[PDB]
Structure 1
Amino acid sequence: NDLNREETRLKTFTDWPLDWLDKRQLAQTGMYFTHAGDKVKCFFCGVEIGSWEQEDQPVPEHQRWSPNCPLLRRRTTNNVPINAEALDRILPPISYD
């Protein structure tokens, strides 16, 4: 029962400080809560992002600091989504950068 599962990542978000930033979308896109401030870490690429500003979005910020993330790049990973269609809907559209 690892963080490769969206369900497990979502449960790490206990005591999430940001009411305006969606923990569900963060967990859905690879993030788990580190429990240090508002810092989250991606289980697939390892990027850690914190000190979020109200203009920041889950996927764009993730893509901004980690352009080659396997999950965001739509490569094969061991991720287990709660809802596959919802994940496909939120991941960055395909494109060769």
Structure 2
Amino acid sequence: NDLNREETRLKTFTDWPLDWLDKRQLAQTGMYFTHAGDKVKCFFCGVEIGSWEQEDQPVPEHQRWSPNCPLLRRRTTNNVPINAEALDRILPPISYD
């Protein structure tokens, strides 16, 4: 469960093929690299996303396919960020769906 740690997730992004898609923001928002193409997987909701298009963004795409992710929904999780404030800044604004 060191993957609960952003630091650990960030480390899996070795040989990340997308120079334009921020691996730091992906790791920060629950994702880790699966090393299969460009697909990443959220450690908190389990969604797997790949075939990224340059118009795609880390958080919105994540919310799009997993609107109920505990991390994005801002409910408690075992996530250990590197910088809490940076995480707060990027997570979707509180919105009761």
Q: What range is the shorter-chain TM-score in?
A: over 0.9
* Cα displacement (A) at 1:86: 0.1
* Cα displacement (A) at 1:66: 0.1
SS of the aligned residue for 2:4 comes to coil
* Per-residue Cα deviation, 1:76-96 (whole angstroms, up to 9, x for no partner): 000000000000000000010
* Per-residue Cα deviation, 1:14-58 (whole angstroms, up to 9, x for no partner): 000000000000000000000000000000000000000000000
In the alignment, the residues of structure 1 paired with residue 54 and residue 24 of structure 2 have an alpha-carbon distance, to the nearest angstrom, of: 17
Structure 1 residue runs of 4+, over 4 Å off? none
Q: Cα RMSD over matched residues? A: 0.6
Structure 1, gaps ≥5 residues long: none
SS of the aligned residue for 1:59 comes to helix
In the alignment, the residues of structure 1 paired with residue 4 and residue 46 of structure 2 have an alpha-carbon distance, to the nearest angstrom, of: 12
SS of the aligned residue for 1:14 comes to coil
Would you tell me which structure has more helix in proportion to its own residues?
A: 2
Give TM-score, length-normalised by structure 2: 0.99
SS of the aligned residue for 1:3 comes to helix
SS of the aligned residue for 2:9 comes to helix
Counting matched residue pairs gives 97
* Cα displacement (A) at 1:2: 1.3
SS of the aligned residue for 1:86 comes to helix
Give TM-score, length-normalised by structure 1: 0.99
In the alignment, the residues of structure 2 paired with residue 95 and residue 14 of structure 1 have an alpha-carbon distance, to the nearest angstrom, of: 34
